[PDB]
């Protein structure tokens, strides 16, 4: 971003809390070696969208000095023969090349509803394409560089699997 | 044949040559497309899973009546222009529809109900084979009939015997599957049934036990479930909005149609009321006596013994008492049934389906 530090910020405890799991692997990842744990990627944002929430990506991640790739949910829809999550798989090639890479999912409640009735039409593929996104948090890919940030409007029926304390860690409320 | 010499001479000469002209416009792919719309300039619209793109113009061999909006036609081999038309037959791809069969039915087992039997025959069977009396009088006869009560007791079995007495095409459509959890499937399939079958005059559609549709209460459209109230709204178009010449006939036999009735019946499209009636001493003799016409049993047992004192046993109750007592006697391989199986079959039928409200005196 072209913007200076947080204009939506001012909370010292919560904002700096996110930078501890970010800048640690960027320089010396020697703290997690003695502890013997995988570096946490978990970041969760719940509250009103766009207010102290959305702009944290263009502000905090802009001063880290890392690659910031905006990932819209309306650009990955691909209404005709959806490639969907297979597009995102090609994006992680920059993470293996450029280590300082940050990925930000912007205000996605669309994949949240799990549809317990399962009477959907075009949304049955959405729960299907979401499972490929879970593979990046599950399978062969282990980095600690790319950060996992997903935002939502309300703690409704949202998929509990992606809410795992390993997948999502820091939960920043908007009080 | 006689004309094979004189008249056939200036015939086959142009009969074989035009077939060669057909082979020029046909070939042998004979691609089967779909005609969406007829154009006065003789041009068509191609349809195919390969997504064809064609300006093809309508050729000869077809007319305005044969060409139909959305039925398959034959195409040219190279230019893919329309040539022929596909002939429809067998079972269409719409919902379940019976075609034809001749049942063996008459008035036998339901004998004794003739009070209400001759009533339904006046508005159904009579205005079919004798299309008259409406020119001199001028009053339109009713469309269908509505029966409410216990089915299979001889009230619905009456409708089964009328189907054969029509000596024409009879249709039976299922009214259950419309209640599917999907929204909007009800009004669709129902309209295509009466629209395609409008060519054949006799229909007489029968439906059994609809307990779902008909939720209205104080207003016309409430905030209730949409799987129900909107499905009924299609029946208003058939009985009121769009009316035929008297070909289509809708018959519904359910338990209690009371709350269901005045969203549909309308004042005078369909006038019928038939309810289950407790048979008297005369009706019970004709129901049970005729069932024994082909039955054989002990000559020392009277069939009217249990008719004097009995509680609400209709033709459906007797159908089991004949079968239950028959299977017990058939175990010994005998065509006659003893007296002990008569009372034994009546108890288990009366002790199961037959239960009163324990309302005395009054």
């Amino acid at each position: 971003g072209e913007i200076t530090f947080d204009g939506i910020g001012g909370l010292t405890e919560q904002i700096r809390e996110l930078r501890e799991v970010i800048e640690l692997p960027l320089k010396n990842p020697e703290i997690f070696q003695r502890v013997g744990i995988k570096p946490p990627k978990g970041v969760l944002l719940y509250g009103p969208p766009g207010t102290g929430k959305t702009l944290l990506a263009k502000a905090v991640a802009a001063t880290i000095g890392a690659n910031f790739i905006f990932s819209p949910a309306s650009g990955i829809v691909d209404k005709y023969i959806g490639e969907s999550a297979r597009i995102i798989r090609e994006m992680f090639a920059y993470a293996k090349e450029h280590e300082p890479c940050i990925i930000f999912m912007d205000e996605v409640d669309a994949i949240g509803g799990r549809r317990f009735s399962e009477g959907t039409s075009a949304d049955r593929e959405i729960q299907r394409t979401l499972m490929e996104l879970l593979t990046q948090m599950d399978g062969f890919d282990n980095l600690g560089q790319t950060k996992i940030i997903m935002a939502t409007n309300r703690p409704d029926t949202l998929d509990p699997a992606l809410l795992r304390p390993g997948r999502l860690d820091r939960k920043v409320e908007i009080p | 044949f006689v004309s094979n010499s004189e008249i056939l001479k200036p015939f086959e000469k142009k009969q074989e040559e035009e077939k060669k002209q057909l082979e020029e416009i046909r070939g042998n792919p004979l691609s089967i497309g779909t005609l969406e719309e007829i154009i006065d300039d003789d041009h068509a619209i191609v349809t195919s899973p390969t997504m064809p793109d064609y300006y093809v113009s309508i050729l000869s061999f077809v007319d305005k009546e044969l060409l139909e909006p959305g039925c398959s036609v034959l195409l040219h081999h190279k230019t893919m222009s329309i040539v022929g038309v596909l002939q429809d037959d067998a079972d269409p791809m719409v919902s379940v529809m019976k075609m034809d069969k001749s049942p063996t039915e008459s008035y036998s087992d339901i004998g004794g109900l003739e009070s209400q039997i001759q009533e339904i025959k006046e508005s159904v069977e009579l205005p079919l084979t004798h299309p008259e009396l409406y020119e001199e009088m001028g009053i339109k006869p009713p469309k269908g009939v509505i029966l409410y009560g216990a089915p299979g007791t001889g009230k619905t079995l009456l409708a089964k015997a009328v189907a054969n007495q029509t000596s024409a095409t009879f249709l039976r459509i299922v009214g259950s599957e419309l209640i599917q959890k999907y929204l909007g499937d009800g009004p669709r399939l129902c309209r295509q049934i009466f629209k395609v079958a409008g060519e054949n005059a006799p229909s007489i559609v029968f439906i059994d036990e609809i307990d779902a549709i008909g939720t209205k209460r104080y207003d016309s459209n409430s905030g209730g479930e949409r799987e129900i109230q909107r499905t009924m709204l299609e029946l208003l178009n058939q009985l009121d909005g769009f009316d035929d010449r008297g070909d289509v006939k809708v018959i519904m036999a359910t338990n209690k149609i009371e709350t269901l009735d005045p969203a549909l019946i309308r004042p005078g499209r369909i006038d019928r009321k038939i309810l289950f009636e407790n048979p008297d001493l005369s009706t019970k003799k004709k129901i049970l006596g005729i069932h024994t016409s082909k039955m054989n049993l002990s000559e020392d047992v009277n069939l009217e013994t249990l008719v004097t004192t009995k509680d609400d046993l209709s033709g459906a109750d007797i159908q089991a008492m004949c079968t239950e007592a028959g299977l017990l006697a058939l175990r010994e391989r005998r065509m006659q049934v003893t007296a002990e199986d008569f009372k034994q079959a009546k108890e288990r039928v009366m002790k199961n389906k037959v239960e009163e409200n324990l309302e005395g005196l009054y």
Partner: protein
């Protein structure tokens, strides 16, 4: 339910001492056991298993023989599958 649409509704006998040997007298054909296996006596030590669960108890008996890696299954391995199967039925 109508007199002659549905004639009779047949009720099956509940499980008992003699009903627990139901599958034991049949499934034991294709399953390897010994001659010290009393189908009626071992059934007295079981509970709530007649048609479906006896097939599961005999299935669990094969898993216990995999630890000993032998070709036979005796009455000692049966008691291990009596309580394990009932623990899943008592849930919920």
């Amino acid at each position: 339910l109508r007199p002659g649409r549905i004639d009779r509704k047949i009720e099956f006998p509940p499980p008992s001492v003699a009903a627990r040997a139901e599958i034991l007298r049949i499934h034991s054909r294709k399953m390897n056991l010994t001659r010290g296996i009393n189908l009626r006596k071992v059934a007295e030590k079981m509970n709530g298993c007649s048609g479906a669960d006896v097939k599961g108890v005999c299935t669990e008996a094969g898993m216990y023989a995999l630890r000993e890696r032998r070709i036979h299954v005796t009455q000692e391995d049966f008691e291990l599958a009596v309580g394990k199967v009932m623990n899943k039925n008592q849930e919920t």
